[PDB]
Amino acid sequence: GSHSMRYFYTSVSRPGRGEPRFIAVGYVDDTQFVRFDSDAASQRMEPRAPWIEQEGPEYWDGETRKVKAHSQTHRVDLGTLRGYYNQSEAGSHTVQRMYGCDVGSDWRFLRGYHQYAYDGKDYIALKEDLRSWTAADMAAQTTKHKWEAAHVAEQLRAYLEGTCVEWLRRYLENGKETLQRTDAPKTHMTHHAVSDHEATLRCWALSFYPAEITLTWQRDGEDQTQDTELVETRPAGDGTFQKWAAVVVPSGQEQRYTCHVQHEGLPKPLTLRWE
């Protein structure tokens, strides 16, 4: 029932190569719906999901202007931070920004986020109360003082509790066939002789949405942690996700093992057995 909207921005400086590379993406839950790339020729925010293409020219002009502003402030920030930490001009550095909002099963506001990292390390972040900042070091403390003097957190809170959640609800309505759907996984088993006395059972979950899922093995009903192997959930490339879990078993004992599959799109968990 819960839902999320997130914007991710990354700026990487390119010393001796001109302007920093800037890439912005927007997600609703696990579905990307917008993208911007300073290297692309269009210089505009672009649709990545079908339900967002409905928006008219005012939407796209506004989002392009906003993402360009973010690009510009990030490019200023790269130099600002080089100064803060007294770093040379010859190396590459990375600024990342993320913000967004979470709503509950009733689509009411639940959480807000606004975070900055420098060189893969936390720099500054809006605290959970949406009223104050946490700073990772002294440079971030200068940023925090500047933002407190400008009352940034109040404007940010008004954005997160209004525009962010309101347009998330709009997207969830318009993209209902995509965002509000739960594709239960398509599961199957493969079997492979590893040696003349051992076998591998692999349990596949495919084409599920959203990405959260649980695969567990058990032997005669007892959870089987050891002799197993699971891969991280991975995108299929078409908006769905994949995962598998495998266990090595004595040949002739495959019937004792069961693969259990938990997913939101399943009314009850699935149980798969080889024989």
């Binding site: 991710f8 990354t10 990487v12 893969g120 995108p235």
Partner: protein
């Protein structure tokens, strides 16, 4: 300077069927910084016209990307993903296994 090694998975978008059109994927995740070299290899040869998703990152700020290409698997054609990164002194080659 935080540096994180990429995790790599090579896999097909659909379960492999010889003679059928499909998509070969190399998913790289958990790396920092964002600079990364990812190539898909057919029989050890670099494939051209390889596309990639838009750079994004996780809660711990580490990046992830999906590289993909249209292909048609056969019985005896070998596919792989080659990843180079500032954390990988030796480039990593991960071979494609249709059941993985």
């Amino acid at each position: 300077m935080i540096q994180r090694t990429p995790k790599i998975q090579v896999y097909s978008r659909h379960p492999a069927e010889n003679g059928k059109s499909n998509f070969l994927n190399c998913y790289v995740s958990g790396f920092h910084p964002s600079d990364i070299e990812v190539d898909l290899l057919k029989n050890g040869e670099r494939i051209e016209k390889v596309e990639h998703s838009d750079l994004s990152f996780s809660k711990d700020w580490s990046f992830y990307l999906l590289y993909y290409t249209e292909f048609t698997p056969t019985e005896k054609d070998e596919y792989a993903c080659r990843v180079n990164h500032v954390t990988l002194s030796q480039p990593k080659i991960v071979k494609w296994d249709r059941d993985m």
